[PDB]
Structures are given as C-alpha cells and as structure tokens.
Symmetry: C3
Subunit: 450 residues, 3 copies
C-alpha cells in the first residue's frame, strides 16, 4: 500500500526567543524539520505535505530544495485543522502518517512498525510509557484496542495511574482521514480542533484503533525551548556515537564527540576527545584523529594521523599523510600521499605533491606544489596589490628556504633551490639556485642598553 | 525589618591540602566566601560580619575590597562561639541570618523565604530532605514547629527514618541571638559550643521555631575537599547554562560550557562546545562562538562570528567582524565593524579600523590601523633594542605587503603601498609606494644533493 | 605463601572489528592486558603465565618487554583448557590467581582480599552482586561456603532472584589446580572445558570454597566491544580524577580530564577543563594548566603557568616559566627558570636560558640560547639544503630582531644585537651589532587601484 506523510511545522516557537520559527532550529547541524522530512523519505513516502505558517519566508529560504508540498496554514486552529489543509491531496487508498516537525528523533524502524500494525479502515496510534504521565492523555485499552484517550482533568484515580500515553503520531488511510477530519469539532476549553478526536470518531464508526508503543521515550520527545533542544542533541549524539563504537570506531569518549552529518569509516579508526565531524566525511583504515580537531567535508586516506587542534574543510588528504598539530586546511586543499603539514600552517586552494613537507609558520594559497618539495618555515605565497589571486606553481624536488615570499604569478621549475629570506618575483628555471645577496653593517663594541 | 548577615569562614580546610584557607577556593572563578557575601548583599544586608581565623592574612589580601566587618576568631570553639564574636554588633531589632562560607550555592530566593517565615521573637531554621540522612540531626516537628533536633547517636528507630535534617542556617532577631548565645554550653563529646542548641533554648523560652525546607539539596551543600568542590562547580555551571538556554541562548552542550562571571546576551546567540566565558562579557544579537574559544572581559557586537580556538581578553569587537580560527586578542585590542582577523594572528593594544583585514601569521602591537587596510601575511610590528614599546600609526586604505617589518615609532599615511619583504623605519607619505630593491645571485645548473 | 598468576588473553575479539587481538586495545593509553600484568606484578606474583592465541605475532611485538611466560593455546577449548596449558609450571605449594586479560579494572586491594580468604586446600571465588543477574551463574551458599554455581537455564524461581553471581576469578594452590583441571569435562551445550567446574570438583573432594564479593561492579567488567571499552575508560578516568582531587589537585571538571600514564604533583596545582596528561608527568607546587593543554612526558617546575592550547612533549620547564597560549614544545625542549614562550612558537631540541623570551611566531630548533635573550617575533632557525640539522648557538643577553633568519651552523656571542629582517650566516662576535642595509625604491603619488 502506498504512503504519504504530513508534517506539522507551523509553530512560532515563542519560548525559543528567536527570530526563527520553531522547527528551523538545528539538531546535529540540521533543522529539526529536515530530520523528519528525511525520515519520511526513508519510509518511502510518495508525497510529504509540510504544514507551515509562522516564519513562512524563512521556512521557504531554509528548505528551498526539499521535495515537499507547501501547505500554508494561516490560522493555527489545531492539529486536526492543520492536517485538514493537506487532506484534499490525500489519495483515498494510500496510508498517511502524521508527524510533528518539532520531534526530530522519531525513527524509521518505529514508524514502519506503526504502519504495519494499522488495521484496514482503522488507525495505528503511537503511544509511549512515562513514569510520570501527569498531564498527558491516558490510553484506555479494551481487548487489545484503544477505546478512549482520557485526558488528565477527566481521568479517575485508577486511570491516573495508567503510564501509557498518547503521542499524537498516527497512521490511517486517506479516505478515513478525509471522513473523520470533517467531523472534528472544537468544543473544548482551548477551542481547538484536535487530531486526538479521530480515535473517538474511529470507535464511533466501529473501526479498530491499535496501540503501538515506542521503544525509546526520547524518540517521540518534542523541543519547546532550547534547554529541551539541548537534551535532544545529547541523546542524538550519544546514539550516533554508540552506533559507531559498535561498528568498531574507537571513540575515546562518546560524551565528547559530535557528528553533524555523515561519517564513512574503515577499520581501526581512533578518535580522541572533543572532535567535531561535519558535513560528509570519509576516513580510511587506521586513521587517527587527535584531540580538538574539526573535520568538515573531507576525505582522509588510509593511515593518516591528524594531530591535535587541526581544522580541515573541503579538503582531500592522501594515505600516510601527517597533519598537525595546529594545522589549517581551507577549501580546495589537496594533500597527496605521504605529505607533511605542521604547526601554524595554513593551506588554501592548493595541491601539494607526494612526499612534500610544509611544517612551520607558512601560508600556501592558490598554489600547485610538486612531489618531494621542502617548503621552509615562514614561507608565504602572496600577490601584488590589486591582483585577482594569481597562482604560484612549484615543480618537483624544489627547496624553498625559510622566510621566502613567493609573489604570484610565478613558476619555480623542477629541482630549483631558493635561499632563505628571498623575494621571488621572476620565474625560476630547472636546477636554478637563487640566493639573496644581503648587505649588512657591522658595528663592533656596541654595548646594549642593559 | 532591617537585616544583617554573619558568615562563618574561619576554617583551615585541611582536606583541601592547600596553603589557602578553606573558603578562598573558587567556584566559577570566585572564592566560595565571595559567593556568600554577594548573596548576603543581594538580600539587602546592612552589615556583613565575616568570622575569619585561619589564613587571616590571605583572607585580608584576597577580599580586601569587600564591604564586611572583619571579626577575628582566635580559637574555633564552635559555631555558637563564632557567631558570638559578632553578636556585640547586632542591632536588637534587626534580623540576623547565619551563613557558612563553605556553602556558596545558597540562593537569595531560599533565604528570602526563610526570613519571611521567621515568627516574632522566634527562629526560622533552614532544613533539607536527604534520602540517606545518616549522621545528620533529625528535625522533630510537633504541630508545625521544630521542638527538637535529634542527633544520629540519640535518635530512636522511628526518628532514624526521618529524612528532614538540620542545615545550621537560621534567622532570628539580634536581641534573641545575644540572649541565647550567652546560654549555649559545651557539654558534649566534642566540647564545642553549637549554634544548634539555640533551637532547644528557644523552646525553653516558649519561642517558636519554624522549619523552612530548601528546594535543592545541592544549594545547602558545603565543600570539605576538592572532590566535593568539583561537584558544586558542575551543579553551578549546569544551573547557569540552563538559565541561559531558557533565555534563548543556543548552548550546543551545556555540560561543556563554563561561565565564570557575568554574561549579557542578545537574541539568537550560538555557543559551540568547550567555550569558557570569564569576567564581564557582552554578546550582541546573532553572535556565533565556535568550539574551544575563551572570552574574558570582552564586548562583541551584533553578527560577529568567532571561529574555533580563538582567545580574546580585555577587547572590543565591532558588528559583523570575523575572528578566528586560532586568533589571539590581547588586552586593548579594539576591532571596528566589518574587520577580519585570521589564523595565527596576535593583536595587542591596538585599534583596527572598519573593513581592515589581518588574516595570517601576523603580530600587531601598540598600533593604530585605519579603515580598509590590507595587512599581509607575516607582517610584524617591532621596536628597536631598549625602546619603550613605541607606536605604529597606519592610516586608511594602506596596503602592507607580506612579511614586512614595521619598526616603531613610524607613521604610514593614507593610501600608501608597501611591497613584500620590506623593512619600514622611516615614515611613509600619502600615496607613497615603497618597494624593496633585492639583489640576488642566480646559479644555473645547480644540482641538489639528492 | 608464594603467588603466581595466569592471565587468559587468547581471544580474537571479533566484535571489536579490528586487526588487533582482543586484549591489545587500550585503556588510558595502555593495553587491557598490560593493566592486568601490572596488577599481577603489584600483588607480588613470582610468575605470570600469559595464555595467548589469536594475533600471536602482534601480542609478541606489543608486549615484547613484559616479564611473562608465553603459553600458546592453539585451540580455544575453554577457560579450564586455557589454564591447564600453564598448569605444568605451577608450583605445588604456591597460590595461583586466575585473571582475564579483557577485564583490566580489577584492583590489587580486591585480589589481596581474595587471596587472604582462600582456605587451605580450598578455593577463593570472586563474586559480584548484580541488580539484573539474568544470564550469569548464581552463587549458592550453604553455611558460609559456595556449594554450587547454578546457571541461568537450570535455576529455579527462588534461585533466579539471587543477585550474587560468579566472575570466574579465583585463587587456589598449584597442586589443587593440577588435580582438578585433569577432571574437568566438556559435557555441556557448548562442548567447552569450563574453569567454573572446579567449584563442583572442590565440593566433591570436601574442600572449602569461600565467596569474596567485589566492592565495585565495574572492577570485574570485561569489554567485548568498543562501546563497553569506552565505558571502562570513563569509569577508570573518573576514578583517577577522584583520587587526584582528594589528594588536593584542583581539577575544574573531572569529567573532562584524562590521565594516560602517571602524574606526580605538588600542592595547589590547578588543571582547567580538557587537559590530557600522557606518559610520565611531574608538576611542582602551584602549577596552573589552562584549557586544552596536552602534556606528554614532561617535568614542570614550581609556579609555572601553561596557558590554553599548549602542546608539550619530552620537555623540561624550570620554575616560574610562562608558556602559551598556542605554544608547542617538541622533544628535547629545555626551558630554564623564568623563561617566556608565547603564541605560535615552536621549540624543538633546544635549551633556552634563564629569563629569555620567545613570544611570537617563531621556530627554534637544534639550538642553545643563553640567559636574558630577546628572540623577536618571526625569528626562524634554519639549515642549508642537504644539511644534517646543524646547531645554532646564541649566548647570553642577545637581542635578535624580528623576522631574522639564523642559518646554522652559526654562533652569536654574548651581548650581540641583531637588527630586524637580517639573514645571519656568519658568526657574530661579543657586543657586535649587525643591521641589514636595505635598498628601497620610493614612488610618490602612487594611486592604489581602488
Ligand atoms: O494549528 C496547529 C496546531 C499546532 N501545530 C503544530 C503541532 C506540532 C508541532 C508544530 N511545530 O513543530 O511547529 C506545530 C500546527 O502546525 N498547527
Ligand atoms: O568555631 C568555629 C566552628 C567552625 N566554623 C566554620 C563553620 C562552617 C564553615 C566554616 N568555614 O567555611 O570555614 C567555618 C567557624 O568559623 N568557627
Ligand atoms: O579457551 C579459552 C576460553 C576463552 N579465553 C579467554 C577468556 C577470557 C578472556 C579472554 N581474552 O581476554 O581474550 C580469553 C581463553 O583465553 N581461552
Ligand atoms: Mg616572516
Ligand atoms: Mg623576512
């Protein structure tokens, strides 16, 4: 049977105290609503109906590329009213799962189980057991099926001790949604049209409502403020870390590890404390990451060691390379196999060839460096004033003496040797030695002012 | 009714294994006793009587500016004896609250409630419920009021199961303190004069003793060693973080956030993991702080992003500025709006004008830099030998080529251009171009030793 | 009575998903099996019989220097079979303690207590109380002694509620081991020879089996995968941190502190969050370590402050020195008393004399620097091409101007002064002033392209 999703995301999120609407705040680097959209897609949803309202323009800009049907809800008259805005687009004989944009941790596995348990022409309701269920609607079962959701203020002493409560997440066919939504009223203290009332309406029609318990309480938790959001973040990171640990990644402390994207890994990977992995990251076999590193959108080959406090982005590092500590790889940094990048070195939009070393106090930008080069401490690639970031081309087996400035556009051919303290503006030929002639004044018997 | 405070702080703190006396060890960057003094001041205390003893000279130096009455207790003969040293200074018809210098987490709100509950000519006693009350004096209530504090060794089976215990924190009027303190004896296993005995003496005089429970167990906890102190630190930081989160500050992980002072914030502020905020810090709207940053006594304007592993102190940063990663702002660094400071850059006691950039491997000290300047990689401001840190003055729209040394005292006027590898000792005029004439030796066919 | 140990370490550790065998994965920087070997040595074990199998060659290379008897178990036919491989080497009247290489947290104190409780010709069995004992063999006591270990599948309702279970850790004399091991069969669902069966065999011979409870559940926990290993790591670090805190080390957050080796400390030492201590580290009195530092094999004198994000290895720092932030000490760095090393400075295999300062953007390698020297920002020690890392010798009271290159081999004698931007290739004499003669072209009225 086909499937489509409805995601409620119209909320202002007042207690976030933000200019953003509620569902755009991030978990693991990605909006809460994007998590739910992805999960909806994982389930094989044909359509995803996004009910939006507050911060409409921001929603549109932040989620511009998402494959969803944009359903504007001008007035927040209740969860049933929200879902009914998308109802005209429901296929009569597809299943519809209702999800909430502020509850990002809900898993595919739990939702697959919910959908499977849905009886024909009936409802599958996602429930959860709370140790303190105070305030939530209690699930009343009579011979396997949900006959009522009894609210806190209505429940008797016996019912108050029921720990199983309603989450509001549910599945039913499109025809049934269209039918029952038109029959939901707002005769209550809040004057709202509640999706909850579908359970009563289903029982009225002698249609079966089946309860399906969520395994994890936190999986169905929503975030109404940033304290709650921080709790979801930590639960999520702990779970990501646990999975990686069971896959054989050595994470020294999973409470001090953050993944904000996707990690692909080989075997015997070691990640020390306080590492942050962002975007799409790939690590080969036996990669070692030291404390305090940040990797965003990088590919790291086999047997690479990244030493502490290194920051890498949009970069590629070949096998057996050595990076850090205190190294900076900026976008377009491409390090070949067996290369070396050391402390207080910045590499931007440059390729560095096999075996080459750049180990101290150096800036290399917009450059091509060949194989087995020695880039001395203090070397800087620079431009003339008013230039448009021109390129420095360094061949193979070149020695560049310490504290030399390479002034682009310039080429240094294979086997060239450049002395310390040189200013290179003209191209250097193959096997050309360039050394600076210094003039110095020597004054003997100069007593220092001490 | 007026109020004054007495703070017991005479302890050696032997189990700290320190040359400091007990109450000078810090929580959130500030001595335990200073927390209590501040809380006493928040309550509107007219006088604060500080009972001190061990490490007297250190107490005097560390708390020199505190508005307290210094009451020296030469012998630690007990809590009642301690309080009686300050008693001659009690006003007969002011309230007196007794606090302990090693219990820094006690809140104003709890103490206001304690004072409010104090019956005329009676005592208000702060109590706390412990799940394991073993060792502590059990509170015995007979019709709403405290009739006895029964110690562990005296209590019967029934009383041993009482979970409410005595904290020793109490409020009574000055006249009553003077009266009852003179009647406290030391006939006990320890030979000490216990403040606890005031409850018995109050009941003797048919004066009412009212119990007031503390909401948080940790709020009344003292620290006798550094393990306990670390527990108070974490409880305190968690509470500070929680408050900020509910105020709308996005703290990615509140377990990896430290505030040691005061934070003023706008809306939509984002703070990544392992950030430390010290002294008085102010952040505008939409400030983003990356992982590993340290901010001490800084003002940060709207829309500033501070990238990872940046350390800033006694500095000001204008709106839309970009700092980091690996940036160092030392005291007196003043960055205007829309400025840029990059990796491995150190700025000390300098002003940098709007739009200017200092992006790599640079030291700027004792300088004024104007607007829209380009400070190249490797640039260093320096002095002659035996100088007294003289100033470098750089005007507006100046280009300083990479690896140039600026030798103070020197001025570079508006629109000047300085070539790479230059040593500037003489003033540079408006629209003056200064380039270094290099002499180089070129040797062709130099085969490298490889 | 003499003592020897047997350590079971033959396991593949399949669920680690590693090329290493199970017991070589590290806790606190050291293989799990090495922890157990050290503990065995602490007890005064005469021989340590290491039962190994999978990853034999890796075990041999990683533990090459360990004083153990290498006992190869070609087939893992069970714990009794494992121990019997070492049995021929047991002395008849020495005690033998059996330990597991994947359970590294077992303490000397617990094992001393186990051995003490061993009755003559009997067995001492280490047991532990679990809240959920499901799956583990229940200890059956009849008048003080263990009469049976009843497995999950055999136990009756009453026995299932027994919380005390078997750990497999046990002590008995060598003669008794030889006797009973020969009588262990493999008639069970797994077809394995279980060491557990010694308890039945002991009771058969009317020999006493005494239960000794472990105080900490985690102390006897093994790690079968990296998630479990991470849990052992955190328990271990928490325990190390707690001990240091009770000894008087101020650890700001013990959940963000890692010791991977041994720490020797004085009084009033302060360690901020996210510090890693590796190898053998010694800190004097009043040492302050700022956030993010890494210290590996270092000696730090009294009153040293190490500021944030400093990385030190195989180095010595004299009293009252100031290091950091962003300082790098590489192996062989020897800093005298009252020295200063600042941000973006790298010191390798060099000695730096009393009072000298190296405060910015500098590399010093293979050098000797005397007392009260001023090493300016941007200074770099370097070599000629094809050199073998020659030495730079700087005397006392030398001023080296900013951005100067020192080209080894070279000597600069006492009291010399070197101007900024100099290239030093020739030796500098006592009280010699060396300044660079720059040639510059000045072009007036150069309008920048803006
Ligand atoms: O009328 C309503 C009821 C509330 N609702 C809503 C329900 C749950 C979550 C969110 N949200 O994440 O913003 C919104 C809606 O979207 N519309
Ligand atoms: O005689 C005494 C009893 C103990 N006492 C005391 C009581 C509580 C806390 C501290 N302190 O924080 O140091 C001291 C005193 O100050 N004096
Ligand atoms: O036949 C056997 C039983 C299993 N065993 C074994 C038992 C416990 C722990 C380990 N280990 O840490 O690898 C191995 C062995 O060493 N041999
Ligand atoms: Mg330089
Ligand atoms: Mg230079």
């Amino acid at each position: 049977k086909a499937l489509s999703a409805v995601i409620l995301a119209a909320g202002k999120g007042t207690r976030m105290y933000s200019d953003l609407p509620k569902v755009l705040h991030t978990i693991a680097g990605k909006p809460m609503v994007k998590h739910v959209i992805d999960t909806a897609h994982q389930l094989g949803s044909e359509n995803i109906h996004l009910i939006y309202g507050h911060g409409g323009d921001l929603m549109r800009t932040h989620l511009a590329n998402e494959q969803v049907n944009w359903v504007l809800q001008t007035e927040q008259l209740g969860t049933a009213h929200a879902v009914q805005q998308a109802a005209p687009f429901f296929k009569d004989n597809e299943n519809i799962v209702v999800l909430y944009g502020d509850a990002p941790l809900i898993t595919k596995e739990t939702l697959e189980k919910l959908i499977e348990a849905k009886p024909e022409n009936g409802i599958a309701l996602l429930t959860v057991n709370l140790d303190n269920p105070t305030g939530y609607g209690r699930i009343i079962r009579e011979n396997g099926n949900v006959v009522a959701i009894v609210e806190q203020k209505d429940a008797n002493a016996e019912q108050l001790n029921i720990k199983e409560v309603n989450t509001g997440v549910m599945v039913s066919d499109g025809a049934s949604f269209k039918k029952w939504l038109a029959r939901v009223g707002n005769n209550n203290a809040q004057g709202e049209y509640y999706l909850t009332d579908l359970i009563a309406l289903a029982n009225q029609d002698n249609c079966q409502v089946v309860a399906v318990q969520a395994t994890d309480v936190m999986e169905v938790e929503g975030a109404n403020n940033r304290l709650q959001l921080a709790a979801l973040e930590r639960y999520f990171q702990n779970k990501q870390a646990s999975k990686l640990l069971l896959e054989g990644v050595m994470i020294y402390d999973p409470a001090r590890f953050d993944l904000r994207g996707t990690l692909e890994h080989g075997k015997d990977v070691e990640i020390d404390v306080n590492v942050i992995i962002e975007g799409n990251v790939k690590l080969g076999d036996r990669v070692k990451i030291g404390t305090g590193c940040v990797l965003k959108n990088v590919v790291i080959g086999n047997d690479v060691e990244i030493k502490p406090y290194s920051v890498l982005e949009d970069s590629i590092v070949g096998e057996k390379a050595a990076i850090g500590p205190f190294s900076r790889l900026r976008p377009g940094a491409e390090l070949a196999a067996e290369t070396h990048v050391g402390n207080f070195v910045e590499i931007k939009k440059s390729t560095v060839g096999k075996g080459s070393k750049v180990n101290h106090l150096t800036y290399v930008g917009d450059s091509e460096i060949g194989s087995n080069c020695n880039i001395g401490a203090g070397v800087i690639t620079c431009n003339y004033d008013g230039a448009n970031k021109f390129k420095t081309i360094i061949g193979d087996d070149v020695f560049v003496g310490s504290d030399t400035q390479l002034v682009a556009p310039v080429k240094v051919a294979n086997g060239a040797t450049i002395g310390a303290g040189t200013t290179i503006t003209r191209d250097v030929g193959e096997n050309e030695l360039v050394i600076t002639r210094v003039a110095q004044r020597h004054i003997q018997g100069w007593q220092r002012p001490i």
